[PDB]
Amino acid sequence: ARARKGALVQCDPSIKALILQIDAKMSDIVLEELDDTHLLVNPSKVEFVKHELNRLLSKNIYNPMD
Amino acid sequence: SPSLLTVIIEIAPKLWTTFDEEGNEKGSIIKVLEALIVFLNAHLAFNSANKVAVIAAYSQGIKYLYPESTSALXXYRRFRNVDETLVEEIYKLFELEKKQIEQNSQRSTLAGAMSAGLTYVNRISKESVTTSLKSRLLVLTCGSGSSKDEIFQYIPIMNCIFSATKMKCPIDVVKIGGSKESTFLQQTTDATNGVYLHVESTEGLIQYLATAMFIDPSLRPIIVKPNHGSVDFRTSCYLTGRVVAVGFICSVCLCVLSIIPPGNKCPACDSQFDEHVIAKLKRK
Amino acid sequence: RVLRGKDDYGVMVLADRRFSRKRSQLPKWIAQGLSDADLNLSTDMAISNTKQFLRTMAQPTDPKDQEGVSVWSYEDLIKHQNSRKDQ
Amino acid sequence: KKRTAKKNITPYQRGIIRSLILTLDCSEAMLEKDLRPNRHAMIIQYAIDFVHEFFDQNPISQMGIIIMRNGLAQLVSQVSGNPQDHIDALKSIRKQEPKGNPSLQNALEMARGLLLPVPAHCTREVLIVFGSLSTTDPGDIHQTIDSLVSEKIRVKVLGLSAQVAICKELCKATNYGDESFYKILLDETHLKELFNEAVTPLPVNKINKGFTLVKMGFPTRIFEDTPTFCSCHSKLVYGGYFCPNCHSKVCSLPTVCPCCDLMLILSTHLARSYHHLMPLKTFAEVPTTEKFRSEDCFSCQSRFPXXXXXXXXXXXXXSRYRCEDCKQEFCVDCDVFIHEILHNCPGCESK
Amino acid sequence: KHSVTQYLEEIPQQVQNRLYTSPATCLAIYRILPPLAKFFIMAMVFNENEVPLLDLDKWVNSNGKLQFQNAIKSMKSLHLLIPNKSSGTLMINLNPTFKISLRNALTGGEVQNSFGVVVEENVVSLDLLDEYSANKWETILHFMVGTPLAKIPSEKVLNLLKHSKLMEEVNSTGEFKITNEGFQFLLQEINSQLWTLLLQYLKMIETSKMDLVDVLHFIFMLGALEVGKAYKIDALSETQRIMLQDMRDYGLVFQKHSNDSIFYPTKLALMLTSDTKTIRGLKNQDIPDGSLIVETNFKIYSYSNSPLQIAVLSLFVHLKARFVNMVLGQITRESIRRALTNGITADQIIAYLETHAHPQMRRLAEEKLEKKLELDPNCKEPLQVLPPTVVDQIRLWQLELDRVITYEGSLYSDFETSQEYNLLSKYAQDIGVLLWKDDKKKKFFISKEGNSQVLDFAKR
Amino acid sequence: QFLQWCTLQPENCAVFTSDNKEMFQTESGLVVSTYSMVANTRNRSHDSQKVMDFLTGREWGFIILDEVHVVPAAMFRRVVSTIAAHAKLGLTATLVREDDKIGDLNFLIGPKLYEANWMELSQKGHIANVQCAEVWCPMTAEFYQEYLRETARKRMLLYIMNPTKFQACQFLIQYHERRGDKIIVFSDNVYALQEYALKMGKPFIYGSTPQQERMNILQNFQYNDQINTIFLSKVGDTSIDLPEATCLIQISSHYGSRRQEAQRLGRILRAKRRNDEGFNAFFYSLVSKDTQEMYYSTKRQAFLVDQGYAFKVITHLHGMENIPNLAYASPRERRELLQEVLLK
Ligand SMILES: [Zn+2]
Ligand SMILES: [Zn+2]
Ligand SMILES: [Zn+2]
Ligand SMILES: [Zn+2]
Ligand SMILES: [Zn+2]
């Protein structure tokens, strides 16, 4: 019985890349990257990936809303 | 699946006598009664507050026991009331036991009790459209003698199978008594997806009752545990009284005759047959 | 002419503006059937009216006791009722 | 106020054996907009229901199915005691759309010859659900009706919301002069009840025909399932039946044996004929002020019976619809239900 | 829903068996197990012997065996049984405390915590003492989610909500607002909400003087049956009575007046588990007294109303001018954006609208239902049940407020040949267990239902 | 475009401009003249007056009027100052008009018989089925980085250019070419449209298309199915003799005000005497999802459903990446074309 658990993050390669850019930004918590459309991460830190993803987008977007 | 388990039990004080007669009087229906009291609480408990009910048959009539028709105008405390109201109603049936009850032993109102129940279930499924109750019933009989095959109750047995098959009802039967596979019941338990257990007299049926009579309620994925084969070589030649195989069936009467037929007016309806048709049947 | 007996039916439509004012000029038994709301109809609600008519008429509405009123059953509802009517 | 029948003039013979062959209309007129999807689609819904009903109360019978497209009638399910063949045949048809005209002369012509193999004891029957208003006859139709009435093939047809004299005539002609058989709906439920009523045998006043003694035997289920084997389908069936005379494994069916050819029945089919043949007497609605019986029902225990004097509510009616031969009360529910599923009059059974 | 069942297995084996000490709590834990698990309990409750798994495996035939794995896995996690690698085989037997406490409570046994109720003149009327309890819920719910008047006076309750973060409202500022947890409070209706709060108080009231078995015995005593007389007086522990009185104050004990009487067995204790009918100065127009408006035009047509309810409706729609029957409000992508600002996903609101606002949307839902499920294989086009047009806008709005995705399961390996992966994948779509796959990688991150069955088929 | 399909023989109907002298006072049958003629400062040859002299001279029973509101009522009040016919006919086009003076033109022609309740009548079977759709072109970092950098409206072509948007268009092109259908595209860009028309490579109507080439492509478009894609810029409205609509695509969505968007929707979606396709009037709107006009793309959707046109969204394209000419498909070239379009 083999079963390798984790946090499978599947998205577009670009957000993946961004998430991976973001994931590289807090110390490579992505355990594995299954393909261009999937990522395997430790759930302990995915929370903060989005937080900085949020901040960096909040730093980036800043929401003009024209 | 709230399943309505309604038990129908027949008590002729001549047949409960036979339950006393068989073996020794090592325990009358009370062992079966205390078995049933425990069994009724369990299925009541099993599915989602799934209701129960009880009817009986006198020697000379029938009556409801747990449904407890309008009269005024522990363990979960619903087991208690279901048991005790049943215990009180049935003891009221035993005071309705005397010589005149002992009198009308010619008939067995088993036929009437079970037709009345189908009116009751059609009545509850009609009302309980919400929470459609995956109901299913039960039969317990004290196998008594003096009538090897009382054949006066055959058509209502078979008609109600259709309604039972028509209303899609699995039907389980347990016979307590002498080893007489009630062929018509044996076909019946077979006909409408049921389980036949011809248990012996004095065994606490609780082990038996829980095993094979809980099969259906809504489940039916599990091997029914019926008794042996359910042969459908049906009623004896009405004229002969021998079970026919190549039956000889009269006419619009549809009476079953053996190789016996009188050649005229088959012995269930006044229908003369074409002597040519009789001779054609005799061309062999 | 489209009608023969009391069991007969059929539509007798009138198609002209002047028919609105000549409803009285029609014979009584025709006039009894021509009601006020049936005047000057456009062709459209004419078809809906006869549509329901043909359907309802197509039904076997035979009470056989209201026909005791309108058929005056055999030699009796005349002899019973009308020989009472000699008043 | 009551809508109940006076008297039945036919409990004596019912056509217990049948060969009913239902024919449909897949023509343009079925695409008009009166019935909810159309004529075409909602007609087919109730036919499926009737199909299930027709074989439940006359399972000894068979049926075939024919459509009516493009002035050409087209058989879609053979005359069979197997409803699923017809049911599956009906499932495909609704997916095609009705077209062309109903050429009744076509449809009548193939119906008449389809029933020639149907024997004397089996009854020939045709049920036309006509919904268009014009036909297209390949030949003389009176020739065919004359040929039809000659073959002892009664015809009852269910016109849509209209009356057509020829099917007035056809139902009149075939059904022994007794025109009772062009009954027509105004309504879906009227259509629904038009379907349910076509299930039972159809006696009006039977003429004296050869009452033929019918020789058959009864099959018995097989046990060995690893020995899954069949003589009626040549496949691995985990247990079938065995004809009493042929001795060949036959799958579960009231169908005839396929090796010695005797009708295979267990017991269940004939008892539907019994309550078909000898039904009960209708539960009389007891008079309101003259009943004075138990304030309950009999088949069930329905304490609702009145309210004891309520000016209007009590002077209305006392829910005591009681059968006669038993003289036992029955709530309308039971009285309706007793008369609905289990004939088996509860009072008349216990005595 | 936190699925409180997962909490019972989380408490270690002993406190379960400690919990299992009262045949009440034996008889209680039994009703939540999956029906396969239920069936495997009672068999080996009475026949006083363990059973090999091969029989339990042969008892369950093909598909439905997944519930056979559903049964046995929940069974072991809460340790009401003891697996036994006795001779290399599997000897299955109850945690015996369960079976006999059950068997006792089955055959009139010693569940005195179960028998802790008392029967007396049950003066609690059907209408009496639960309107306070129902109003208790109404007032505190208006307090917790934020009503026009937040009449929730449960100081112990308010601390649990803020301390447990039950609502994403500023407890420091007194805010009772719906956060991610507060949005989840708006989702779990009766069980799940009744589940969710029972968890917060246990987390809150767990530091000192817990007595969890007594807490669980006392909680299961008040909700097990109407303790009636002697419940809050006698059939209650010290911390249990404080819990019972605290449950009394929270309404979950409809503890009768005088603060010292039998367990006021409010109906609130019943609903936490019953998962059945939910309906609870001197006027209360019901049941359809509530009302709302949700139709294809995406607008509120309110004729019936309820203030906390329309306050709740206003939590995701603008209110402009409450009229005689209508409240001036119109649901838009802006209106739901009031909740998406709170991170409230357009997921629970889906189930909310299909259930809630129905008392005015009965016909509207009923006309939407049309019974288009048996007609579904017949008429392949379902007739707008349930409304799909709203959810796509919600999803597209949710998709507009989105772009983070993740999956559960476990990555799998040792798939040696293409035939087994092709055969395993083919069967997986038959039961529907595979999130994403690829023959190239021979890896996928899904549930283990695929791995358990191939092992069981290979091994037995 | 209709009156010869109509029963009318134009031999009688003297068309008048007073640059267009025609047979006044001898015109035997019905007449078709125009306002600026019939009264204006554009009362500009005595053909005009003499027609009007004839208009007064001959007694007229009925007056068919088309868009009286645009031209001042005063001249209509002057074609209502002089002649005294018997009837007029106000076939008005808007509920509220600048000729809604307190004495309305309703109370001079005949009462209202036909109004904003266009549900009784057109539903009786006149109009066919029109399908509308709105594809969400997938997001790519630069557009957002382009969205991020400027909040200005200059993002307009920056999501219009989406090469993925070109792709979905080409799918319809091969699709409607496969179906023998006809495609209208509403693209006011010049470069990215050329960039796209270059990317497609069919004889293409585009920005400032030669009307003959327009007509040539149109002839090669409606009668010839080989060219089954034309691009109508803002020069279509207003106005050309707009071509038939089976597959309308709209790229630009500012095109304000919204009263025009009712116009364009009505104007660009012309009628089609083809029933081979199940939705014989496709309306499409290729929008880069997650861009500036999601607000304004959501503004178009509410308009159409108010107009009642059958509408849908197709973002799960069948073979989205399977189409030919995946030019600029990559986010880089979308970025590269985004740099290409930042010029525009
Ligand atoms: Zn006979
Ligand atoms: Zn076979
Ligand atoms: Zn045979
Ligand atoms: Zn009754
Ligand atoms: Zn009777």
From Swiss-Prot, chain A:
InterPro entries: TFB5-like_sf (IPR035935), TFIIH_TTDA/Tfb5 (IPR009400). Component of the general transcription and DNA repair factor IIH (TFIIH) core complex, which is involved in general and transcription-coupled nucleotide excision repair (NER) of damaged DNA and, when complexed to TFIIK, in RNA transcription by RNA polymerase II. In NER, TFIIH acts by opening DNA around the lesion to allow the excision of the damaged oligonucleotide and its replacement by a new DNA fragment. In transcription, TFIIH has an essential role in transcription initiation. One of its GO terms (cellular component) is transcription factor TFIIH core complex. Belongs to the TFB5 family. The keyword Nucleus applies. This is General transcription and DNA repair factor IIH subunit TFB5. GO terms for biological process: nucleotide-excision repair; nucleotide-excision repair, preincision complex assembly; transcription by RNA polymerase II; transcription initiation at RNA polymerase II promoter. It comes from the Eukaryota.
From Swiss-Prot, chain F:
GO terms for molecular function: 3'-5' DNA helicase activity; ATP binding; ATP hydrolysis activity; DNA binding; DNA helicase activity; DNA translocase activity. A motif (DEAH box) lies at residues 66-69. GO terms for cellular component: cytosol; nucleotide-excision repair factor 3 complex; nucleus; transcription factor TFIIH core complex; transcription factor TFIIH holo complex; transcription preinitiation complex. Changing residue 5 to L: In suppressor mutant. Present with 825 molecules/cell in log phase SD medium. ATP-dependent DNA translocase. Component of the general transcription and DNA repair factor IIH (TFIIH) core complex. When complexed to CDK-activating kinase (CAK), involved in RNA transcription by RNA polymerase II. May have 3'-5' helicase activity alone, the TFIIH core however has no 3'-5' helicase activity. Also involved in transcription-coupled nucleotide excision repair (NER) of damaged DNA. In NER, TFIIH acts by opening DNA around the lesion to allow the excision of the damaged oligonucleotide and its replacement by a new DNA fragment. Belongs to the helicase family. RAD25/XPB subfamily. This is General transcription and DNA repair factor IIH helicase/translocase subunit XPB/SSL2. The lineage of its organism: Eukaryota, Fungi, Dikarya, Ascomycota, Saccharomycotina.
